[PDB]
Design a protein around this ligand. Structure first.
Ligand code: BG6
Ligand code: GLC
Length: 441
């Protein structure tokens, strides 16, 4: 009875050696990607060559697309930083619709925002936080390689997103685009937390999707020219193991989720960690358990067939230690999954199991990065801060802690501090754009 439950959850409980191997293999994927060999990490240059270098003034507009929230932002950088913002809705219809409609909508929001802020005629430098993989050969350009997460907008892949915006601006007849800067949310976060922490050289995202960036030494980035200095690299680690190198880890439940997704075979490592997917990993487990007769006494809970019932907000609430079992059951009776205690206990165990692996994997990841940076600089010890954002990370009872613990376990010679971004990527984006303006003048 409970024997089957543990047998089933066994693969989600990774021992030290297993986790070390994950770190080992990411470390290898990083090496290869940078030398231009075949890696599942794209290791994309971002052309951000320094964390916030002292004073960098300017008033910037800022887009933030690809997260749970799409937001337009005004960012005023002087002695201090002042941000105004407004969220707008992007339904799956628009997100997976036509590129034309997508950016038409984006522009409409900018006009709306601008009109509400009195910006109006003034065409400001835009800091575009665009949380997807781009091939950049400069701050002011970024060719979308692939959509990820919940996006599938047509006629966009292979397009420079700065162009995609121009074409929309001209169509919606908005104010002419000025200096635009493309930044990944990881890079945006890193730079935001970097504003008031010089040792911040890594951006980590664990929300809808997961990814990381970090300051690599320029000599090691074979794709780009130059030797002196360093440059931030967007690892795009969500797609880690897309080459099938993480077959060792994939459970049957991971498989079921992947095949059932918009992008089968893609972003495999992400599908074992981030908020968009964890809830589903659980659901399949529960389905398997019910069919084994363990859960629900075999009885068919059709509601369990419904996709995306276990959301981050829920996964974070279910595991709160301040909940009594009656309250856990209440929550599930409130999602249309009434449970008996025993069932409720197994469900809660399943969540812990999944979210644990999620935190641990991410930990092994951060471990590889911090080690890479340390070894890159020939150091025996490293003090480094990680600018981190994401609702899962930010809300989940144990995730952040379990990561920090894993980073100690696996990268002891490094002293890693985690900074939670209080102001989002818009702040960092603006700082990057400041350089992009200097780079034009
Ligand atoms: O998908 P989530 O939970 O909103 O987390 C990721 C996002 O978190 C936001 O706070 C950042 O400003 C975005 O740049 C980022 O993409
Ligand atoms: O938003 C978090 C992450 O989502 C996906 O992994 C994207 O590929 C990546 O660009 C982004 O950083």
């Amino acid at each position: 009875s409970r024997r089957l439950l543990e047998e089933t959850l066994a693969p989600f409980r990774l021992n030290h050696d297993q986790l070390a191997a994950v770190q080992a293999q990411m470390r290898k994927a990083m090496a290869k990607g940078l030398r231009g060999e075949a890696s599942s990490l794209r290791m994309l240059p971002t052309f951000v060559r320094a964390t916030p270098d002292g004073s960098e003034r300017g008033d910037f507009l800022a887009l933030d697309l690809g997260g749970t929230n799409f937001r337009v932002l005004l960012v005023r950088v002087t002695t201090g930083v002042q941000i105004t913002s407004e969220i707008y809705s992007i339904p799956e219809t628009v997100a997976q619709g036509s590129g034309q409609q997508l950016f038409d909508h984006i522009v409409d929001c900018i006009v709306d925002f601008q009109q509400k802020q009195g910006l109006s005629g003034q065409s400001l430098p835009l800091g575009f936080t665009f949380s997807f993989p781009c091939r950049q050969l400069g701050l002011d350009q970024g060719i979308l390689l692939n959509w990820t997460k919940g996006f599938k907008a047509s006629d966009c892949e292979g397009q420079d997103v700065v162009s995609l915006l121009r074409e929309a601006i001209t169509r919606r007849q908005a104010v002419e685009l000025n200096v635009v800067a493309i930044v990944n949310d990881t890079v945006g976060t890193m730079m935001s937390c970097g504003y008031e922490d010089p040792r911040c050289e890594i951006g980590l995202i664990v929300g809808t999707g997961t990814n990381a960036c970090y300051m690599e030494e320029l000599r090691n980035v074979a794709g780009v020219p130059g030797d002196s200095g360093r440059m931030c690299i967007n690892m795009e680690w969500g797609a880690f193991g897309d080459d099938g190198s993480l077959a060792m880890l994939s459970t049957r439940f991971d498989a079921s989720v992947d095949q059932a997704s918009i992008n089968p075979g893609k972003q495999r490592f992400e599908k074992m960690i981030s908020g968009m997917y964890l809830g589903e990993i659980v659901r399949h487990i529960l389905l398997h358990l019910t069919s084994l007769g363990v859960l629900f006494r075999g009885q068919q809970i059709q509601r369990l067939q419904t996709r995306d019932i276990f959301k981050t907000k829920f996964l974070s609430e279910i595991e709160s230690d301040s909940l009594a079992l009656r309250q856990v059951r209440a929550i599930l009776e409130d999602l249309g999954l009434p449970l008996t205690s025993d069932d409720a206990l197994m469900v809660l165990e399943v969540c812990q199991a999944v979210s644990q692996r999620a935190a641990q994997l991410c930990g092994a990841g951060v471990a590889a990065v911090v080690e890479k940076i340390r070894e890159n600089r020939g150091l025996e010890e490293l003090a480094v801060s990680v600018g981190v954002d994401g609702t899962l990370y930010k809300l989940h009872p144990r995730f952040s802690s379990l990561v920090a613990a894993t980073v100690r376990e696996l990268a002891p010679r490094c002293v890693v501090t985690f900074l939670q971004s209080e102001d989002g990527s818009g702040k960092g984006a603006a700082l990057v754009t400041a350089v992009a303006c200097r780079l034009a003048q």
